[PDB]
């Protein structure tokens, strides 16, 4: 008796949506990010009593990162000089180093500065960046020329893992949580929410993503439950295996002239010809993959797990592919991953061959090249491994065989951008309650 | 609006290496994956591997891993499949089948070529 509706405003209710993100980071360097200006400075609060659900593969924001990344890339390369003159006939022999066959890299014809004079010049290339044009074998061409424009990156603009806070906009909540053992669905009993997200890296890589976070627990294999058919399983270490890579030779920019922009080839090499390596610690290596086993065979309990190297693809794929400084590795990682498990503290070193290429494709797509400028000197990289990107082979009737890949970039950040979740603040809300107003 | 062409087939002679082909046309090339299934005369469908097109990475059939090889070219939207040393139970017509993958699964086959 005697109960009116009455409506209250700034409830804590809200409803799950999708919306745009703003960039957030620190003071701007090199004069990928591009957003300025901002200071940051989140702070978490524990919503008591709440339970929330939540879910990796399905949310927008993962997609957002990713076309945030492109878009940024191609900003980047928009004002920097384009390499089409450079697709004329080369003619290669290339005999003059130590090691031809490593290289195996041309002399062609450019147009000068006077466009009714053309200047022959010759520069070093790897020949996974060279075809073999059909019949005498000495002639060559550039490998994506016949198929798109190549653009050389901008030397000073060297964009790198910058970490960026993603910050959610007025109206909206970015929901957070940290139960230990949250596999990526379900609900959490622990839940939080910030304006801006941690600092994520934007790294690239493949058959393994490095530079990462760590875990709280033992490690986690986070996988896609619709069914046993997946594409990915995503397993994210809780310690950093540290891995070690190197470029020893002594490369020699040059410059060809081109108006005023200029292409940077690699004008020689200096140092004896010792091919691009990396390190990894052999015990830690054994114990990590044994403590993957372990835990990877609880899914499936009654099958042997085996592991072995990818088959087929680009190099992007067969080869775990990165980037360190402004050069990119593609290290054969047949060694690693080559174990077998029953079904039922840096002693040592394992060594795995790298091989460098500058003309890089747009890891997502093709149909657009990127030119890598070569990096002067001698490189060295170290950076900490923090998960892997495994898939499954189906059919193998009573054993397992799970075998690296992880091509697609957007697994990378749907391992990063995994906590998170956005929220509709919805503060209206209605009730029941004892009332009057006067007439 | 999607059509998956196909090339190749007739009389292959026995031990001897063949390959068909395929066309994709209108759809996003990099989002769906690829299948080869096959049909003997008097048996029922079974599958014999898949390619993914971005990528290019290949899974076979476990009784057939060492004769087969999948292999595409992008910029012409263009598949391929080899079968080494074929034998006589090999007779079969070899359809190409589009996937409709999730983000994270895969599932049910819709246009057949």
């Known amino acids: 008796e005697n109960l009116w509706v009455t409506v209250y405003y700034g409830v804590p209710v809200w409803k799950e949506a999708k919306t745009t993100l703003f960039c957030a980071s620190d003071a701007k360097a090199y004069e990928t990010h591009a957003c300025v200006p901002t200071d940051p400075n989140p702070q978490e609060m524990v919503l008591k009593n709440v339970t929330e659900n939540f879910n990796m593969w399905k949310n927008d924001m993962v997609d957002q990162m990713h076309e945030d990344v492109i878009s940024l890339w191609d900003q980047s390369l928009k004002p920097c000089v384009k390499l089409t003159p450079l697709c004329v006939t080369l003619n290669c022999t290339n005999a003059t180093a130590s090691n031809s066959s490593i290289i195996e890299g041309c002399s062609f014809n450019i147009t000068t500065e006077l466009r009714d004079k053309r200047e022959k010049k010759n520069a070093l290339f790897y020949k996974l960046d060279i075809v073999q044009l059909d019949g005498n074998s000495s002639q060559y061409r550039l490998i994506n020329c016949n198929t798109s424009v190549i653009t050389q990156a901008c030397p000073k603009v060297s964009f790198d893992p910058i970490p960026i806070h993603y910050c959610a906009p007025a109206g909206y909540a970015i929901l957070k949580c940290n139960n230990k053992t949250f596999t990526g669905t379900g609900p959490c009993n622990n839940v939080s929410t910030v304006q801006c997200t941690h600092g994520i890296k934007p790294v690239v890589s493949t058959q393994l993503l490095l530079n990462g976070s760590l875990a709280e627990g033992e490690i986690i294999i986070r996988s896609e439950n619709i069914t046993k058919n997946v594409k990915t399983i995503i397993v994210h270490l809780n310690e950093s295996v540290k891995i070690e890579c190197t470029r020893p030779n002594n490369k020699t920019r040059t410059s060809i002239r081109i108006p005023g922009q200029w292409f940077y080839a690699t004008g020689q090499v200096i140092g004896d010809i010792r091919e691009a390596y990396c390190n990894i610690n052999e015990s830690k290596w054994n114990e990590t993959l044994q403590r993957v086993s372990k835990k990877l065979k609880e899914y499936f309990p009654h099958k042997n797990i085996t592991f072995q190297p990818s088959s087929g693809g680009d190099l992007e794929i067969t080869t775990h592919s990165f980037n360190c400084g402004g050069e990119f590795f593609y290290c054969n990682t047949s060694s690693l991953f080559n174990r077998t498990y029953m079904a039922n503290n840096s002693t040592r070193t394992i060594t795995i061959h790298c091989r460098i290429k500058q003309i890089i494709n747009m890891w997502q797509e093709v149909g657009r090249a990127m030119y890598a400028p070569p990096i002067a000197g001698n490189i060295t990289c170290i950076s900490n491994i923090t998960g892997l990107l495994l898939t499954r082979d189906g059919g193998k009737n009573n054993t397992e065989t799970f075998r690296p890949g992880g091509g697609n970039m957007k697994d990378n950040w749907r391992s990063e951008l995994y906590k998170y979740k956005v929220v509709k603040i919805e503060p209206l809300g209605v009730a029941p309650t004892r009332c009057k107003r006067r007439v | 609006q999607v059509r998956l062409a196909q090339y190749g087939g007739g009389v292959k002679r026995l031990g001897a290496t063949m390959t068909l082909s395929c066309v994709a046309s209108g759809y996003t090339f990099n989002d769906y994956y690829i299948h080869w299934v096959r049909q003997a005369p008097g048996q029922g469908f079974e599958l014999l591997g898949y390619?993914?097109?971005?990528?290019?990475?290949?899974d076979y059939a476990g009784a057939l891993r060492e004769r087969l090889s999948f292999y595409r070219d992008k910029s012409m939207e263009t598949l391929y499949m080899d079968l080494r040393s074929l034998r006589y139970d090999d007779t079969a017509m070899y359809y190409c089948?589009?996937?409709?993958?999730?983000?994270?699964?895969?599932?049910?086959?819709?246009?057949w070529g």
């Open positions: 390619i993914d097109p971005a990528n290019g990475r290949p």
């Open positions: 089948v589009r996937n409709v993958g999730t983000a994270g699964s895969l599932l049910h086959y819709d246009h």
